[PDB]
Amino acid sequence: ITPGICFSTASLVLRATDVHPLQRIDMGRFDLIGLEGRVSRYEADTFLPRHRLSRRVLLEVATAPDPPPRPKPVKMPFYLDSLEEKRKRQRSERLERIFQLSEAHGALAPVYGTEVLDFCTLPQPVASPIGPRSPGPSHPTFWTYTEAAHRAVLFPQQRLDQLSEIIERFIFVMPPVEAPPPSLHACHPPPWLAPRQAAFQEQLASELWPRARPLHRIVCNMRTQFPDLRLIQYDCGKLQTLAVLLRQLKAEGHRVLIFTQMTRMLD
Amino acid sequence: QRIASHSHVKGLGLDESGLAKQAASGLVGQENAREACGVIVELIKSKKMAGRAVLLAGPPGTGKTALALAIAQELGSKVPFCPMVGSEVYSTEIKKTEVLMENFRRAIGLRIKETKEVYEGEVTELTPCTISHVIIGLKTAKGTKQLKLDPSIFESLQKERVEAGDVIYIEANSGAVKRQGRCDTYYVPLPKGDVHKKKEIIQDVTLHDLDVANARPQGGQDILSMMGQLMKPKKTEITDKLRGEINKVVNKYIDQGIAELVPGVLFVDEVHMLDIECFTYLHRALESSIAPIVIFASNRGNCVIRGTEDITSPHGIPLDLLDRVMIIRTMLYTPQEMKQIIKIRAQTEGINISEEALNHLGEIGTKTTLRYSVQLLTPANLLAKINGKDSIEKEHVEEISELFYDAKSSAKILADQQ
Amino acid sequence: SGAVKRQGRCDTYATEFDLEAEEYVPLPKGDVHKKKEIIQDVTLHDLDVANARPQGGQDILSMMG
Amino acid sequence: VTRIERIGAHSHIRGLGLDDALEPRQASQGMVGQLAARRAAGVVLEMIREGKIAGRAVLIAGQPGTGKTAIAMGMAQALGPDTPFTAIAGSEIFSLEMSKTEALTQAFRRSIGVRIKEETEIIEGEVVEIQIDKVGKLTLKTTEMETIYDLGTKMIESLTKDKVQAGDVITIDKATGKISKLGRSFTRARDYDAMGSQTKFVQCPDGELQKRKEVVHTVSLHEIDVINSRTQGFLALFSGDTGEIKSEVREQINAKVAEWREEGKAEIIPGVLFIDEVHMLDIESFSFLNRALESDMAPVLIMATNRGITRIRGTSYQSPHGIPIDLLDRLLIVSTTPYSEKDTKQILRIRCEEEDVEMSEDAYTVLTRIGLETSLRYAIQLITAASLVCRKRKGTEVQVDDIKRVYSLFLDESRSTQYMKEYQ
Amino acid sequence: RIERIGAHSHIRGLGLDDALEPRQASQGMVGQLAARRAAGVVLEMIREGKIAGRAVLIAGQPGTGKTAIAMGMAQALGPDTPFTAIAGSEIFSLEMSKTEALTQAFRRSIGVRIKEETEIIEGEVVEIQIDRPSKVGKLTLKTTEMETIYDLGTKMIESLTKDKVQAGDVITIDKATGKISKLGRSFTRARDYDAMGSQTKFVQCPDGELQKRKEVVHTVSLHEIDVINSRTQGFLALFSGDTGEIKSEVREQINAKVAEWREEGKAEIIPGVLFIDEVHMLDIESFSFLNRALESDMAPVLIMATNRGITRIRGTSYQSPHGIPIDLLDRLLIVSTTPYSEKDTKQILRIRCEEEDVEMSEDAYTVLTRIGLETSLRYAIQLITAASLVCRKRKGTEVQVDDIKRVYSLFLDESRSTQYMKEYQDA
Amino acid sequence: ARAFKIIREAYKKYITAH
Numbered sequence A: 001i002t003p004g005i006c007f008s009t010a011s012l013v014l015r016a017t018d019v020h021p022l023q024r025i026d027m028g029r030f031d032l033i034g035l036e037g038r039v040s041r042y043e044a045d046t047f048l049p050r051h052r053l054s055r056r057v058l059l060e061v062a063t064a065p066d067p068p069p070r071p072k073p074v075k076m077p078f079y080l081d082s083l084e085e086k087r088k089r090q091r092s093e094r095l096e097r098i099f100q101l102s103e104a105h106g107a108l109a110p111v112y113g114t115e116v117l118d119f120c121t122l123p124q125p126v127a128s129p130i131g132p133r134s135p136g137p138s139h140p141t142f143w144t145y146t147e148a149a150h151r152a153v154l155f156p157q158q159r160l161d162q163l164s165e166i167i168e169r170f171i172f173v174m175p176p177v178e179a180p181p182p183s184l185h186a187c188h189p190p191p192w193l194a195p196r197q198a199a200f201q202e203q204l205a206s207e208l209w210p211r212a213r214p215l216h217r218i219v220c221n222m223r224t225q226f227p228d229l230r231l232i233q234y235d236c237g238k239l240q241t242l243a244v245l246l247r248q249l250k251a252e253g254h255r256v257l258i259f260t261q262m263t264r265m266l267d
Numbered sequence B: 001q002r003i004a005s006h007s008h009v010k011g012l013g014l015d016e017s018g019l020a021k022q023a024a025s026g027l028v029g030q031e032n033a034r035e036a037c038g039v040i041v042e043l044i045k046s047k048k049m050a051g052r053a054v055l056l057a058g059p060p061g062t063g064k065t066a067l068a069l070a071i072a073q074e075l076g077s078k079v080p081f082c083p084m085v086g087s088e089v090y091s092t093e094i095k096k097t098e099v100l101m102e103n104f105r106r107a108i109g110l111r112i113k114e115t116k117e118v119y120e121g122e123v124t125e126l127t128p129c130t131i132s133h134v135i136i137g138l139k140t141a142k143g144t145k146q147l148k149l150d151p152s153i154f155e156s157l158q159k160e161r162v163e164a165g166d167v168i169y170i171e172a173n174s175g176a177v178k179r180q181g182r183c184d185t186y187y188v189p190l191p192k193g194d195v196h197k198k199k200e201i202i203q204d205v206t207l208h209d210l211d212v213a214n215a216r217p218q219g220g221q222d223i224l225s226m227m228g229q230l231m232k233p234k235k236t237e238i239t240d241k242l243r244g245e246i247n248k249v250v251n252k253y254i255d256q257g258i259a260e261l262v263p264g265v266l267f268v269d270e271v272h273m274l275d276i277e278c279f280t281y282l283h284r285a286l287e288s289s290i291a292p293i294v295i296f297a298s299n300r301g302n303c304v305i306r307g308t309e310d311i312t313s314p315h316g317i318p319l320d321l322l323d324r325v326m327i328i329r330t331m332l333y334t335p336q337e338m339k340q341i342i343k344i345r346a347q348t349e350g351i352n353i354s355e356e357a358l359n360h361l362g363e364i365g366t367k368t369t370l371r372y373s374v375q376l377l378t379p380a381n382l383l384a385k386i387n388g389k390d391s392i393e394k395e396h397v398e399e400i401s402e403l404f405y406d407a408k409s410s411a412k413i414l415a416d417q418q
Numbered sequence C: 001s002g003a004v005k006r007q008g009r010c011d012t013y014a015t016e017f018d019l020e021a022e023e024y025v026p027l028p029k030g031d032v033h034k035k036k037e038i039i040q041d042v043t044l045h046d047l048d049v050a051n052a053r054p055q056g057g058q059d060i061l062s063m064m065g
Numbered sequence D: 001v002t003r004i005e006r007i008g009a010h011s012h013i014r015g016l017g018l019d020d021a022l023e024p025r026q027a028s029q030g031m032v033g034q035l036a037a038r039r040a041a042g043v044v045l046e047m048i049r050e051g052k053i054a055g056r057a058v059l060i061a062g063q064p065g066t067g068k069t070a071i072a073m074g075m076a077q078a079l080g081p082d083t084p085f086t087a088i089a090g091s092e093i094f095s096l097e098m099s100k101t102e103a104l105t106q107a108f109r110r111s112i113g114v115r116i117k118e119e120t121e122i123i124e125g126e127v128v129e130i131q132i133d134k135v136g137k138l139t140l141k142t143t144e145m146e147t148i149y150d151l152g153t154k155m156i157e158s159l160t161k162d163k164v165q166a167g168d169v170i171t172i173d174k175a176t177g178k179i180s181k182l183g184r185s186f187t188r189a190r191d192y193d194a195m196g197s198q199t200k201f202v203q204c205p206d207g208e209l210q211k212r213k214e215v216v217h218t219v220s221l222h223e224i225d226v227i228n229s230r231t232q233g234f235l236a237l238f239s240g241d242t243g244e245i246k247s248e249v250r251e252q253i254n255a256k257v258a259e260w261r262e263e264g265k266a267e268i269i270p271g272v273l274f275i276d277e278v279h280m281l282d283i284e285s286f287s288f289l290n291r292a293l294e295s296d297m298a299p300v301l302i303m304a305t306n307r308g309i310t311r312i313r314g315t316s317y318q319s320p321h322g323i324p325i326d327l328l329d330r331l332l333i334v335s336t337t338p339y340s341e342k343d344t345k346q347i348l349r350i351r352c353e354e355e356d357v358e359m360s361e362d363a364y365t366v367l368t369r370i371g372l373e374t375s376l377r378y379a380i381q382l383i384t385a386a387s388l389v390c391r392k393r394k395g396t397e398v399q400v401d402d403i404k405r406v407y408s409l410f411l412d413e414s415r416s417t418q419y420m421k422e423y424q
Numbered sequence E: 001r002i003e004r005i006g007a008h009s010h011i012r013g014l015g016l017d018d019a020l021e022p023r024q025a026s027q028g029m030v031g032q033l034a035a036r037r038a039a040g041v042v043l044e045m046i047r048e049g050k051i052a053g054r055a056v057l058i059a060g061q062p063g064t065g066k067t068a069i070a071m072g073m074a075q076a077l078g079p080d081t082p083f084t085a086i087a088g089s090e091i092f093s094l095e096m097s098k099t100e101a102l103t104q105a106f107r108r109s110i111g112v113r114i115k116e117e118t119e120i121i122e123g124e125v126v127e128i129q130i131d132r133p134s135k136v137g138k139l140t141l142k143t144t145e146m147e148t149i150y151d152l153g154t155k156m157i158e159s160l161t162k163d164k165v166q167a168g169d170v171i172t173i174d175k176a177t178g179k180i181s182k183l184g185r186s187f188t189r190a191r192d193y194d195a196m197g198s199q200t201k202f203v204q205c206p207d208g209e210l211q212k213r214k215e216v217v218h219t220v221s222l223h224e225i226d227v228i229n230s231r232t233q234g235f236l237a238l239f240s241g242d243t244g245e246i247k248s249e250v251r252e253q254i255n256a257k258v259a260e261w262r263e264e265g266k267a268e269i270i271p272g273v274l275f276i277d278e279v280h281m282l283d284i285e286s287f288s289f290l291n292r293a294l295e296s297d298m299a300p301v302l303i304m305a306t307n308r309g310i311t312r313i314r315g316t317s318y319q320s321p322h323g324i325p326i327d328l329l330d331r332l333l334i335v336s337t338t339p340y341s342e343k344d345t346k347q348i349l350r351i352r353c354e355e356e357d358v359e360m361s362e363d364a365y366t367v368l369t370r371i372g373l374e375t376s377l378r379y380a381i382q383l384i385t386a387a388s389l390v391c392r393k394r395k396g397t398e399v400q401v402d403d404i405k406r407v408y409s410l411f412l413d414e415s416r417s418t419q420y421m422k423e424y425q426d427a
Numbered sequence F: 001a002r003a004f005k006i007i008r009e010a011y012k013k014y015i016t017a018h
């Protein structure tokens, strides 16, 4: 395990050269890829064209609201003109901003659509010999697949289970050198850099790490190694004769005494 | 700052009547070529044409590349100018057809008026009202501001881990909260201005950035997060249903009056290096209605086209593509034109030279080549400054000509076969 | 390195049941905490690979796979 | 205002200029001359619109500048967006991630259209209140009615994972995906500072709460990419998989489309595959097409080669059109005749009308005489070149002098090869 | 059960005696005495297995029994000894180099066999009592000789419940790891059918002792060892052939550890055979790598089939015999297979038609030997199956001469096809 | 659809009366 992590000592001003809040364009109005899995065809083609919020209604709604109903049926100095005018004008700017943003966040429609993707998508197993999840015997997909054929395919879990007998004894390759986490970064970075990476790593650890439990067995053998517990006994003629005598005597069923003269030899 | 090979070229030296001056805008000679370059640059400013290619053909050392750079400079920065070497097409990550298509769609520019706005300042209080909204207090050196943000932005706030005392940017258009750090009073200084930053962004974008942004999805919260890693390799954007939709949305925006199209100019160098398959796909694609205007540059005469090995064509370009491509010929320079180019290079680089030195330097240029006489400038001035003399006399160029051989004496020496 | 192996349950618990799906190993001897020196040998290419394709730990770097 | 698709090389081809009886008109909508080739194009276009048979192939052959690509664009424009017209070059198949056969397979499957129609009962309305204790209730609202709904385990889980608040116009279908269609109806004033990138407050819906949404959309038979992975729609916007397994492509998708067409939920609409400059294809792609045209649901191919007796790439055998005879046997060859003094001037006049260039009769005559000696596209470019040279000349009508100025400025292939005597 | 009879399914092994004396037509093989004796000598040296990296080259005419001798050696060598058959064109992969594919092919025919003495408990469960308060219980195991009781621990009960073993069930318990394995249902396993039961496959109870010590053996090839040790994905042997193991410690460590194992008596070696059919497909790089790959102590024996003669080496313009450079040809021992005579072709046809269960007449054999001496023995052999079908169609008993003649007139060999190719035929 | 409003009128009348 190399203690000398080769952390990158790159300069500080280069940690983030593209970040510029007042010098970037709103690419959101060109995001088509993000629509496919979030927006529906009926949303853009039929709903918005008729329910697009009009500026008239937007201005009208800014009025005194009304309280909700209470159902219980069981039967069948003075102010400043400049200040109030500035308040009114900033409120008008706010209303114009909502009018603009709501209309801009719905300008582009999906390329395919949620329902189109759901219709085109077949049961996750397309051409696999094992049948998809069937709610029950009420339709063909249940009676059209056989369990005898389903047994013919072994998942990686079953593969690990059946290889566990040889995985314990044949995985012994230790890497010549081990390195700590890939590379730290010596920098004077923007404070908002490390928090995002930390959150990303935490999300990955909470999502995938629980799934990596099975590979822990192989990781142990490939990360560390220990004697076989018979390493020298395979050749110790004294211990072999001892075992022969013990096995020949235990068949009689009598007590045996052993003598030793060394704590370490006792151990 | 630092001088380059074509840094002295400011543009096409053409007068109001289109005729090319003998020496202007850093270019001399090549009157017919410069006039043709202006005639074709007028097409770029008209912008009402597409699918046109102009081939600058001539021997090496001629001002074909210089004329291309002059066209680019005269056009300026509002319209894009995409240079590409024919060798660059041989990519290993993506096919040559798609490299060519990407360059063709990247040449095209797009100017748009982005009316964004971002609130900036130090946080003084965060209170979320299962949340109808969040009230946030911002501070700058113009006063304090109370802001009501959608509960969806409260998630971004919590993820950025902002709290009372930290300086933040919050964009009204998208909700992209960015934590600049903690205030200097507890680090980044306190912003000094109107907390409500409202200004128009007239920044330009290319038509290929739109395709790059939609090629891969950007987000997370799912296994999709695994997609951020894995080399982010560039791959072919299908012509069937991606760039067509991009064109449709761009047309929608142009009709609405937000976006503005500005067709760019492509510049292919050493066209003879392209394969015959690239040539035929090119003469097929440049016939489209959305293709930009392209400037091919040839450096060799009649030779064999790459990929054929059995078919010869003028300029290493097949006739199928050479037809429909306007050919502007660039010819060799005279001694006077070479002397003028050398003097321009000298006065642009900052070296003052005597008359007797410039005369023999132009002689050396006519003897070996203009580019060689040009390259022989800097070392002469360096030796002069080493010897103390600030200018270049005839004793410097004629001594550096002995230190730095040319492409002809080198071959004469190599003739020994060892 | 940070790796921890399970040598098995202490031999003193082997009498708890007649049979168990447990590996039994006697009480480790010596000091609980011990530092030992090893004279290993590795090639420069070993360090090169260890730093180019790092595995380490404490993270989810297993995504190397 | 300038659009994305400004006038190009074949912009003047606004459809195929034929009559109701496929009779070619001399002067028609974009197309000119080439009566026989254009009548053949119309015949194959009618065979396309029919779609009764599969595995057809027409090969338009002629000298460069006779109008092969022109007829192709005319057919494309006459064939409305209803049916797909996939126009690919002869070199768009030499990919690195895809072999020289999977490329043709995907191109074929892309030229087969399918109109999917889907019906679904949908519940849409403003969310007034969501109570939860697990079981709970939901109060949806619309200008026509306000309702109550009891929520189950999965419903509550999806609602909590979507984080729908009061006022949100939620949308719920059977087998709930729970698409949070629109944003908030009320709870405004968030614009005071900012709005989420997905917030689209647009007002609450009207009419009845429940509805039946019939949605029709035209996809391609290349939808196998929409199944070939976990997240499939993503691979449909970039290169995608190196190749989708045949054991699904050629049986599963086909059988499912057949079942859809039997139930009436979808219908296939074959299209056209225009492979321009097909002479670049290797003998492998030709031997593949040999059988691909024998398949059940192949589109109709339209090839455009300008090569005569030439060597076939990848081999040393010379053949007509530079492609194998075993493939030429399965084609239907049309021939385009070179234009004459009469037709060249007509298409030049049409090209001038395209950009609205007012040319004199002497200029027309001189440009036609020039183009009949050097090339047609050369004279076509000379149109715009002289137009610009005269516009800079403070003129309105292009004349013979301005045309000759451009003739001297810009050279052609012939004069360039002639002037290539220096040999650098 | 149903594995059809291929072209080489008739030979069950070299027809040799104890002294490696080839018999005329014993054990499927016919004639070819010299090459069969050489094959037997190399097979004896293989079964000995104290020399590594030896190469043999079986050259000969097309269709003279080279692949036949190879399959015969494979059969006579049987299991428990790696035999890897590969065509010369199989190493030209797109994801791994030719040298890496050759290293894989070599290391795939080297077997490592770990012999272990793990003791177990085999008996028929009589009762499985368990009380949840950690839950504790007991088990009653019965064999035909004795019965016994066991106190089940926590993880023991966990594994028993996971495997869902019940009474009357015959099971084996690995006391070292606690692995349970149910072998079947005993006659007692009868569930007193009164519910939804659909299994009645009974079997005799285990005999012998209750807690016996049997011997297990785990045999895996060096190829599998290095593949599973390459990276955490220890399933590439079945998952996919994605490979490229660096020659760093990984393979060197496999070799060093197998050496220590052989020394300490854990698993020593079992060499193998690599039959490279049509070796002329290998490249000059392949031959140059083999030159030194045959020199490794972990190199199994290899036998390369050859039809070519004086022909250029692939990847270059060097004319060399067998299409192999003399550099590699020098390491090899060359065995030449001779063409079969009339009585050898006839006997081969007889054995083939008796293996594919087709009775031919005495004149059918004569006409077929005539056809097979005038044309290829392979064509003569393929004629048998075609001739049997016409007989079955006309409801015959044994193939006559008229059926063979009809089949000869119906199907064409290469020579008659070429002589019929009198037209252009799209050259 | 309009049954909801028909019922709302009646319930509002009842509430205003009580």
Ligand SMILES: Nc1ncnc2c1ncn2[C@@H]1O[C@H](COP(=O)(O)OP(=O)(O)O)[C@@H](O)[C@H]1O
Pocket (backbone or CB within 6 Å): B005, B006, B008, B009, B026, B027, B028, B029, B030, B058, B059, B060, B061, B062, B063, B064, B065, B066, B067, B299, B330, B341, B344, B370, B371
């Ligand atoms: N008309 C001109 N006026 C001034 N300098 C020129 C002119 N033409 C070429 N040059 C100079 O000569 C050199 C030729 O370079 P380049 O244009 O790349 O040659 P080529 O024509 O082979 O591309 C350039 O450094 C350029 O600055």
Ligand SMILES: Nc1ncnc2c1ncn2[C@@H]1O[C@H](COP(=O)(O)OP(=O)(O)O)[C@@H](O)[C@H]1O
Pocket (backbone or CB within 6 Å): D009, D010, D012, D030, D031, D032, D033, D034, D062, D063, D064, D065, D066, D067, D068, D069, D070, D071, D347, D350, D351, D376, D377, D380
């Ligand atoms: N029959 C025609 N009708 C209209 N325009 C034509 C016709 N023939 C040629 N043209 C014009 O001539 C130009 C060159 O023809 P093109 O289609 O490139 O020939 P080819 O198909 O042989 O490549 C086209 O852009 C087109 O505008």
Ligand SMILES: Nc1ncnc2c1ncn2[C@@H]1O[C@H](COP(=O)(O)OP(=O)(O)O)[C@@H](O)[C@H]1O
Pocket (backbone or CB within 6 Å): E007, E008, E010, E028, E029, E030, E031, E032, E060, E061, E062, E063, E064, E065, E066, E067, E068, E069, E347, E348, E351, E352, E377, E378, E381
């Ligand atoms: N000695 C033999 N005994 C029995 N059958 C033989 C003998 N030699 C060749 N054959 C048969 O001839 C057929 C083809 O010959 P083969 O062994 O493939 O020779 P080659 O490999 O040279 O083509 C095989 O099906 C095989 O059964």
